[PDB]
Amino acid sequence: LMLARQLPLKSVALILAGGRGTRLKDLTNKRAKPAVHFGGKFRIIDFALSNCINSGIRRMGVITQYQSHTLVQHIQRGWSFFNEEMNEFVDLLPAQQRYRGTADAVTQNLDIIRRYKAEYVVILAGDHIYKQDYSRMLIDHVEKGARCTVACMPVPIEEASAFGVMAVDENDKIIEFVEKPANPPSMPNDPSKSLASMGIYVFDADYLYELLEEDDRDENSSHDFGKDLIPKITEAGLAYAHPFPLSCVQSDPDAEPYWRDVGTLEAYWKANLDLASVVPELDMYDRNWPIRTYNESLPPAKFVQDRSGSHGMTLNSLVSGGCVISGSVVVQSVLFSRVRVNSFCNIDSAVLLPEVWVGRSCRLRRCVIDRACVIPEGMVIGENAEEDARRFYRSEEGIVLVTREMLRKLGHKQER
Amino acid sequence: LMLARQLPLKSVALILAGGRGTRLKDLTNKRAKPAVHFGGKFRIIDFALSNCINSGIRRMGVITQYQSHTLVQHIQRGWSFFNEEMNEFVDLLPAQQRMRGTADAVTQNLDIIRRYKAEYVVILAGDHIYKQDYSRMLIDHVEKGARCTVACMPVPIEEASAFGVMAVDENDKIIEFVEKPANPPSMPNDPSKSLASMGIYVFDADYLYELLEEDDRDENSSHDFGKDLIPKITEAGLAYAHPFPLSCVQSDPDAEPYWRDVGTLEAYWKANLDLASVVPELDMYDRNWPIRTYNESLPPAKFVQDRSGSHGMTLNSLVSGGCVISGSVVVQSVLFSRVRVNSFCNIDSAVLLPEVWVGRSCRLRRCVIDRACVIPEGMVIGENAEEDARRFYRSEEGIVLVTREMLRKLGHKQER
Amino acid sequence: LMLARQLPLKSVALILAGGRGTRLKDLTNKRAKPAVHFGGKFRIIDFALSNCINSGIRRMGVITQYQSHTLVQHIQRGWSFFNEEMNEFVDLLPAQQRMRGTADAVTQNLDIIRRYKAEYVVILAGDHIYKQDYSRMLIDHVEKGARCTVACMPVPIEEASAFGVMAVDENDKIIEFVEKPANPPSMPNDPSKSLASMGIYVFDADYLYELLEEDDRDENSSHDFGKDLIPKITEAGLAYAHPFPLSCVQSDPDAEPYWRDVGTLEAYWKANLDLASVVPELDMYDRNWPIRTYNESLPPAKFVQDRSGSHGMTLNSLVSGGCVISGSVVVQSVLFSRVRVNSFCNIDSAVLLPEVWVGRSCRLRRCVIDRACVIPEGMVIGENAEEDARRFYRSEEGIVLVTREMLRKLGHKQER
Amino acid sequence: LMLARQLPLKSVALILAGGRGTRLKDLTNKRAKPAVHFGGKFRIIDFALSNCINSGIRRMGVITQYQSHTLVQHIQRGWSFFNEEMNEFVDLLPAQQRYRGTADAVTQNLDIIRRYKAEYVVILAGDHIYKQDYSRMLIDHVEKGARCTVACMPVPIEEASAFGVMAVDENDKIIEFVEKPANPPSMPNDPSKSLASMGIYVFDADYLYELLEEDDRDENSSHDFGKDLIPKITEAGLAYAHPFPLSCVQSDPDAEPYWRDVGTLEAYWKANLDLASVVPELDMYDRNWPIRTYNESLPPAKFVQDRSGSHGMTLNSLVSGGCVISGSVVVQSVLFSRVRVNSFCNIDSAVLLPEVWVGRSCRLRRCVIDRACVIPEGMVIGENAEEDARRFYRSEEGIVLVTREMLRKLGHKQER
């Protein structure tokens, strides 16, 4: 008794929000992937932080390394609501990175982390969209009596090449850890699945420092948490597994756990339109596990009449507050804040990131419009293949990405 | 030279947010009128607070006469963003009036007001809707060498009986002030209008005090700013006027100034639907003069298909965050937060306050639904007048008010 | 397993901060006793709030019965650091009691309390000084399968008449409860002590409601938690006890638990000087259980030379920020913020509340100076008892209270 | 009229808080000079920011470039109190500097600054300790009708080699600007003084961008605001002067203006002990122009008895809140937060930065003890010259600097 409460308090989170998401290719080109928008108003680092709040861990470390001014701004504006006097804060560590990343990146700020005097460090990732409690994870880490606890999940074998694959024992003890294998070794029972890592580790902190120095001296290591550190603990035999279904926060218990690594642009589009469906897989209307963001004041989403006095028919949409839609059939889309949309437009299966200004008679289909574009009048997008692969970036699955640069290069005056 | 910015600093606002809005019969009988919702996200009082921010007066006094626990909460959550040590704050002054009109609310808390060490005090009576720049008014107050400055606007003579009417000379100096007359006098040039007050007085700091005590040691006055004090000052000739067009904040200078005495319920429906029309009179999309409110983290305005799979139509509407609409043609309406409209409904020119849950097959027309009011399936409002006057409260013009306690009569269990 | 941290989440605290501290004759006759200063920077209520934070109960209800505008302000400035949308907040509930004891303050705001959707409600009566962990108490409450848990501590029999005395069996189940007796009963093993209550009850959510209505529809009860409800529950046998040593937060486990019923003025001087001594009983330097307050930006405690150029001595004292001392030997004293002690003074065992301006050549001994009290030059306090009983209020033990209104009698103009 | 108010609103501040203060030599070695402590609780960037608040410019740009994690932390914790919805914020730009500094450093973030849409940019410095209003400066900049306005002051000729020297005209128009000359050209009237620049410029913003690009293309420039930019505007003839005495905020008007460039270690010590004097030159007890910092909750400054039962005599000291002093004569010192000082110590003319733990019988004289040292027991400092120049850094004027590294190298176990 009195364990699940006293475990977060003695613990501190380290969010590794220094990813780039190179497979998004342009969407994270001007922003760190953790600062990528998602789900109407939120960002991808609003999940990994919220999970720390609602699990009790109010001491967070946001390691913003690569191309992070908007991430600093978001963490400053929305998440600076802490009274440090009671040992709660989201400490915004800049990395000043020297390749040689994420676990050297916890090592550069090793002299700041120590001064928290924490017993259990949570090594998170801030580029994933999950919904988990770590208070149920730390209990499971301390009961087993391990030094490190990896959060693993069974994923398909065709995409398990991109995650850290592992094999566990009866008591969830790591025997064999391999990382990004070309041939993912399946689980013993199911051949179509592999028990892969999620990037959510938990160390007992006095080990962790004690480990990161042995690797800091190491000149032959990659200095990654999944390539030369956990494959070292695994040989030591002190690494245990924590099956993710035990701690995933679900609204209904009859569904598979929801952990989406955004990763690429088509998966971003899928995982951001699944909220616009009838019954979403991610329940954002939850009140026993809410997710916080930088709540900005916008006016209500305005729906006015078109230029001819007609009406706008919005089906399976996710129009957010602040927009102004004039007529314009809007299907299966997700309109972020301030997305003006003028008349006679047909928007189907689109993700319009904030402040996108769509001109008259525009027919957008299966696309992702980047922030603060000015789409001209009469521009069809997504109802052509060879012509949408030449101006904008069309992916292998049909998805289009419209950036504020691709429109400038065509000459459509994005200055506004 | 340097007087335009040193006048707000030496001034303090006194919002007399202790109205009860008696003409708002059942809408305000649970909450004080300053705490009434208007325009999706805002409340009435926000205006009279935001006009104090943008006009530089960052020291406010909210003189909340009781019936309000829901505006103490609103102030404490939204407007508790001040550093009280750099001389900027929103002092929440409980009125604690004797179980004794407006002035006797400033008198009881007159020992708390002196300690602000102010120079010009801005009496507001801020349970109205408008956009004003009070610094303009302070400049006009000091330029004239006045002791009280009343903000006067010409209004129609058929309504001037509700307000204090005044008669000024060439210098905008008050000649004749009559408070709430049965036969309002007209202007010397326009006989159809009347130069009425607006509740916005600006007094000298060291005079009001010397004037309240002299009026507080009396046993004959009603202790009201309009009936007793302003006539007392007019008798001395130290009362000057400020035409409100000079200090009104208009996005378009080709319109007429926007001051709504919201409290009628027939005018609380027209001013709330005024933001749903094609071109509104009150611009909420103005960035040089933004209005702030308590901005909680709501998910986007979700639109989905009906139970059969059809689409939803919207024409000249507002849909704030948290709303969920399924099919159900909407017209001319305004939906506040978390308004789960269900399928096959027909909403026309309605104000749906927060957390209103409209049931299936509900035809709502010219109505004002109080907050958290769970309308049942099949209910029909606004069609046959005698029915709606038999169950709900219907004003003389046609507007209907629906309250939580109003349906429990009819048996429709609420318990949201 | 996972019960230690899921009990605070499903619980809400109700601080009955509506005491008037009648034994604090003139110290609280302007401010409610929860808003009284103690220990330099803190107020009385902070304790009962901070114990709710550190114990995980981040949903509080401050049931402030009126005479308090200076604790509404304190809550709104200091403790308005919550994100109210992640289920953590300090609801400031005005009591608005009929011009009807403690329970009838929870009854009027019983329609606001249901909407929290709580499971265990923590009645506190938080106008005391202590350090407790309520989560320990909730664990002990659910382990016993109880319906109300009373926090009992043994106190001396010569004072137990002030509190409710109880008699428990081996299971800590209440046998006999007598509220504020004239002849308190003693314990079966120690005849010099009495197992008294502490005002800290923990009720089931769905029972209290069902118990308040049953007691609110009566016209015979006093509507007090000690006189009516707890005896009513004892009669059913569903009242269990919680020894307070089990849940007290002690830096040293070799001391006795620290609970001060501050209100006597002779005990508000001893408990405030207890922090000036060599080793205090209440540790304010504890980092695993910090106590928060409103922390304004004050400059350091400046010490300077006298008018002649001599030095100042301090022995066993506290000097908070903003203070300014010039020479003037200080002993055993406690100086609150902005206390400009001037030269040639001799302060011995005194409590100087904020903004006290002591004049030149002032000899202060065994006194409690109210806040902003400008003592004049040459004043002498605590030397000759009959004089201090002729001008100020002097308790039977020797302690003196000095108030702003107390000096105006004598002619010493204050107007700081 | 209506100018001094509307000028800050249309303006934005750019604080160049990227300095190192190379002449402090060790004090800024681990912190950006703007984050250097000063005056008990404050930092050097708490002035340059506060001057922006109390002058109306609530839009600030903090260009943190070099070795800034604590500066980010301070700006996040203390100065993140802004409601961006009303166009007020302290935007914390990281520079990611590529030598080639300060004016290329405003150029890297040229795409963020534009999006404010500001009319007048204030180019401040965050390494100086002044107290000025820029609302009186912008009026003086717009009346003259200049494109740039330099804040200049007459300083001595023996230290005018380290500032930008200039010569003005009758209408304060720059004729000749030279920068860090080896022979400072004096003023025409006074030969012992030179009219030097302060680093506080004001541009009309549409010029500024229009200028920074012409210099961004320039491959032969130093990219500094005082070496190849203002010496260019001066040739253009569009640079005017704003004598600092016109806008310096003084408590009393009979004193010379107070602008201290900390710069070196002896000037740091002088300018930080001048607050501990009887009548300081910098009035920090001002209420019409306060200075904000990260107000942390500490207990009052405790003064206890020594180990033998003696008393501590503090003369002309500035003991801050949080300390614990035991006996120990303390003269002319400045004790920052949490500075424990044990018994029998003699502290004369010292600056003890936060958390310094001084051991028993320590005799410190004319020194600056860096943050979080652990000074051992019996260690004399400053009462020897040849022995204080060999362990610690002794300056040419006698001042000593004790760092947490110089003590480790002696072997005194700074880990704590």
Ligand SMILES: O=P(O)(O)OC[C@H]1O[C@](O)(COP(=O)(O)O)[C@@H](O)[C@@H]1O
């Ligand atoms: O190429 P540009 O001109 O920077 O435009 C790209 C847009 O993306 C942004 O960087 C948005 O990034 P965020 O993800 O931080 O919102 C804007 O600054 C800018 O308008």
Ligand SMILES: O=P(O)(O)OC[C@H]1O[C@](O)(COP(=O)(O)O)[C@@H](O)[C@@H]1O
């Ligand atoms: O009096 P009833 O019938 O219980 O209804 C009360 C409802 O009205 C309200 O008092 C309206 O108050 P708010 O302005 O705070 O929303 C709500 O608190 C509650 O939902």
Ligand SMILES: O=P(O)(O)OC[C@H]1O[C@](O)(COP(=O)(O)O)[C@@H](O)[C@@H]1O
């Ligand atoms: O009633 P008096 O004589 O005017 O004295 C009032 C003083 O006491 C107080 O009411 C004490 O209240 P606080 O607890 O808010 O400090 C002060 O507001 C004021 O300084």
Ligand SMILES: O=P(O)(O)OC[C@H]1O[C@](O)(COP(=O)(O)O)[C@@H](O)[C@@H]1O
């Ligand atoms: O050499 P160390 O171990 O970093 O110690 C130097 C000290 O200075 C600090 O960097 C303080 O810097 P700040 O100026 O930001 O307070 C501490 O982190 C540290 O204790």
